[PDB]
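Consider this pair:
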Amino acid sequence: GEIEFIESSKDAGFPVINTPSKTKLEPSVFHQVFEGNKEPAVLRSGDPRLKANFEEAIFSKYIGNVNTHVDEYMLEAVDHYAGQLATLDISTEPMKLEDAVYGTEGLEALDLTTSAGYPYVALGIKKRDILSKKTKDLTKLKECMDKYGLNLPMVTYVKDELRSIEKVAKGKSRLIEASSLNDSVAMRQTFGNLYKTFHLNPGVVTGSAVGCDPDLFWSKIPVMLDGHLIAFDYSGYDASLSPVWFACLKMILEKLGYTHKETNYIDYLCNSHHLYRDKHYFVRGGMPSGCSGTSIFNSMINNIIIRTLMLKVYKGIDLDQFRMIAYGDDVIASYPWPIDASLLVEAGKGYGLIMTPADKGECFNEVTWTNVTFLKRYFRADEQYPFLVHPVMPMKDIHESIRWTKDPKNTQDHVRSLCLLAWHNGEHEYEEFIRKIRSVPVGRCLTLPAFSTLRRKWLDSF
């Protein structure tokens, strides 16, 4: 992706978007009890922790586009992946408005907490002023969609989250896009059944883990991923995507039965208009992370990409023996024979993609079930029930999270959530975690689950 054009918003009649000033992240009561290195991402240009130009840093992910047509390797990758998805019998019928807005199995209700986008943010109109969970009213929404239409600008926000020391100093904060409520709803009507099918079928047919529950899904992954593991990282996947990959996505959607008109929303994702504070800008390429379906569409594109690279380097590859699962840019895969990931990385560079060894590794090392990660979690089979596999979030990451809070009124829920991750590191680690939590008076006011209770519920969940 590439920023084609940027200018002062006032020159085009757009008001300034007043984004948050300071981080909502503050040190929690546990900040001193546990060790950690991460701090809130830089949100403003004057941040004294910066050692780089902030506005340059946050837009540097738009590294450019490779201008290529869909080639023979892509065409075969699209065909192969489309063959898998056809098994699911995805409906291309529009999802009914009430289901797409207020919830249905496989598609959670539209988040009423996030930005309504343009023009609502300039008019002080929040999502809750239009929608209501308890009434399921669609009257005001139909009014607003008629009044303002579709293909509205996106609003760029800086993501308020913990980041490493290096990423704070380099100013490399992440950006999230808010689609207009109008466009979010229309995309959920157009693709809602696709979204539902993906959420309800994580695994190697969708090639997707979006919406998975790691507590359950993790025992399935080694059954599905039979051979020699393949895994690698991307640097700035979303913004690196060139238009040719969106053309591939449109081809695959059309093979599933979507009309050319129904795939027009992919053009809305690919060629996008953005408001950022006092600036407005146009982007060609790049997935605009945060719009409707971007995790699923990133995952589908990744399924096309990896097959393309395998076909290009390993002529004679048999994709019917290839397996992969993606969560956006994150991939875990297998093939019955060894594959040199460094070769795929070079083929990826030719397509405008930046691929690196897995988990900041120095080289494209041997990937094993001991050292592979997915969704930042390791894989550890249970000592007693070897067919059940723990998702293991590192205690370092749990420690980083517990030291900060965006709202101390939610301490109980925050710490409980962290307990559900921590116990998979084993009983000795969990008891130490609980002991340190309880060394703060708040910690003894919390209802914390017992290790044996967590283990019992986990075993029983299967």
